[PDB]
Each structure stands twice: as structure tokens, then as C-alpha cells.
């Protein structure tokens, strides 16, 4: 499963957010590795919107238009156990709950991250 519990990352506009999602695989987990990152924006009322995927050993993005070209997996080796992603040039519209789903049949794990973006760089 994933190595980190549900957390809240508070960052400032312009900065880059590093969303952690490191996982471990069991011997049982023999199905093809499947990674999906979803988002539930705070502004509109949509939920579980697809952001990026790792399916069939390939990265697939450009699902969430408002987040185009600003999301990439941080690790250069997903299979190694890292599905963490980046969100460059954070904006107020990026606030919401981001979910990381790591699956490898019959195994399945997921983590939720509450990303908050503040206008001026300050959390005091």
C-alpha cells in the first residue's frame, strides 16, 4: 500500500506542490500496475476528475484542462514504488482534494491530499 496517510499541503500561488504517493507491492499483486490521480476541485462541483494515469506502462495526461501541462510524475521510475506528482505554478483554482490510487490486482491502495493555495506566501 501507500506509505503516507491523508495529509494537508498548504502552499502559495506560483509555487510548486509535491504530492507524495510512495507505495509497496506484495508478492500477490501480480496484476498490471495501475496508477490514477483524481481531483475534486473546490470551485466547481465536479468530483473524482481524472488528472493523470499510468496504464499499460505508459503515462497519459491532459484530462483536466485547467491543469494542463502542469502535472507530471516526479519519479523517473514509477514501478519502483513512487507515484508522486507535481503541480507547477499553483493557482487558487487548484484548491481541492487530490486522490492517488495505486492498484496492482488484487492489491489496491489510495491516499487523499488536501491542497490549499494561498494568495500571499504566508502560513505564519
Amino acid at each position: 500500500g501507500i506509505t503516507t496517510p491523508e495529509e494537508m499541503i498548504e502552499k502559495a500561488k506560483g509555487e510548486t506542490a509535491y504530492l507524495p504517493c510512495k507505495f509497496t507491492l506484495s508478492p500477490e499483486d501480480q496484476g498490471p500496475l495501475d496508477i490514477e490521480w483524481l481531483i475534486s476541485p473546490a470551485d466547481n462541483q465536479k468530483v473524482d476528475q481524472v488528472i493523470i494515469l499510468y496504464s499499460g506502462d505508459k503515462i497519459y495526461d491532459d484530462y483536466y484542462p485547467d491543469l494542463k501541462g502542469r502535472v507530471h510524475f516526479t519519479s523517473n521510475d514509477l514501478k519502483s514504488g513512487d507515484a508522486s506528482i507535481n503541480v507547477t505554478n499553483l493557482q487558487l483554482s487548484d484548491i481541492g482534494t487530490y486522490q492517488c490510487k495505486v492498484k496492482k490486482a488484487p492489491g489496491v491502495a489510495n491516499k487523499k491530499i488536501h491542497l490549499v493555495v494561498l494568495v500571499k506566501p504566508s502560513g505564519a
Binding site: 501480480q30 496484476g31 481524472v50 496504464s55 484530462y63 490510487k101 492498484k103 490486482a105 488484487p106
Partner: protein
């Protein structure tokens, strides 16, 4: 057994697992449970990328196919909607078992009841009225066809959501739709 042999599904929360108009542009959730000679099924389809997020003016129907070999095992190639890496098999927790399906004919549409060349016969169809995005102001029809896109000694399921003709410029998504059919074995 760690899995349920009476249930075959795509897992409850599958990621985009279909490349209908373009690469991985749709999520198809399908669960089939065997209850004697009848399989209780629930299907759901939603667009997540490309034209399936903004229904083209000229489109009137959106459908998916699922072809199975003579042992009731899904074939992951055209015209089967589910891509090859897509999860499909016995249910095990919130995922699927990796064991090969050995009792597939228990989930296949009976070819005596629904003969392969009889796809156009009403009996080989279960047609119902449902609603786009679940919005009761947007009625559409779902037609499930049995063994209509089958090879030989094979089986199939076809889901046809039609009447989209006047719901242009809207995302395509269906509510959880129920259906059932007589089993082969």
C-alpha cells in the same frame, strides 16, 4: 477461496479502461453476478476525454461491445471496449483475482435463447428507458444485445445508449443501468 466465483466485474472504481473514440477516454464499470440461470448485471459508462465529454451534434448513439471466447473468457481486442490491461475477472475485495475464469459459461448469454444470427430478434434484446447524467429531463434508451457481435462458439454483450441526438455539447455519462439475461450454463 479469496474470491467470489459468482461475480465477474471491472472492479467498482475502474480508471479509464476504454479507448472508444481516442486513447483511454472512458470509464466502463460493469458487474455481473450469477444467480442460477439468470445473471444480474449493472453497467455504467462515462466519458472522461475527447468527444465523449462534449457530445458531437451528429452523434445519436454511444455503445460498447464485450466479446468472449468459447470458454466465456473476455477477448481484449476489437471490438471489445475494455482495453487489454483493463481489470476483469472474479471479485476479490475491491479488486479482481488474477485467476483465470474457469466457469465462464455460467456468465455467458444462452445461445439457445439468443442465437448468434438472431441479434435483430426482439428476444435477443433488453430495451429500457433511462436518463443521461441521471437528469430526468434528458431521457435516452439503453439497449442490451446478446451474442450479436459474436465470432463462432463465442459470446457477447452489447450496450447501446441511443437518442443522444438532441443532447449536443454535453458530457456523456449514464447512471448505473440494470439488465439481466439467461445463462448458457
Amino acid at each position: 477461496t479469496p474470491y467470489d466465483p459468482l461475480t465477474l466485474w471491472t472492479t467498482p472504481d475502474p480508471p479509464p479502461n476504454c479507448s472508444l473514440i481516442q486513447e483511454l477516454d472512458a470509464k466502463l464499470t460493469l458487474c455481473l453476478t450469477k444467480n442460477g440461470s439468470i445473471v444480474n448485471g449493472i453497467v455504467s459508462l462515462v466519458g472522461v476525454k475527447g468527444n465523449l465529454l462534449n457530445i458531437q451534434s451528429t452523434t445519436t448513439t454511444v455503445g460498447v461491445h464485450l466479446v468472449f471466447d468459447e470458454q466465456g473468457r473476455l477477448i481484449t481486442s476489437t471490438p471489445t471496449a475494455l482495453v487489454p490491461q483493463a481489470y476483469w475477472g472474479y471479485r476479490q475485495g475491491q479488486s479482481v483475482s488474477t485467476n483465470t475464469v474457469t466457469n465462464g459459461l455460467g456468465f455467458m448469454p444462452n445461445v439457445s435463447a439468443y442465437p448468434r444470427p438472431n441479434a435483430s430478434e426482439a428476444k435477443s434484446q433488453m430495451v429500457s428507458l433511462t436518463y443521461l447524467q441521471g437528469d430526468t429531463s434528458k431521457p435516452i434508451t439503453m439497449k442490451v444485445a446478446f451474442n450479436g457481435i459474436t465470432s463462432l462458439n463465442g459470446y457477447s454483450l452489447t450496450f447501446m445508449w441511443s437518442g443522444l441526438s438532441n443532447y449536443i455539447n454535453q458530457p456523456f455519462s449514464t447512471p448505473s443501468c440494470s439488465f439481466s439475461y439467461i445463462t448458457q450454463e
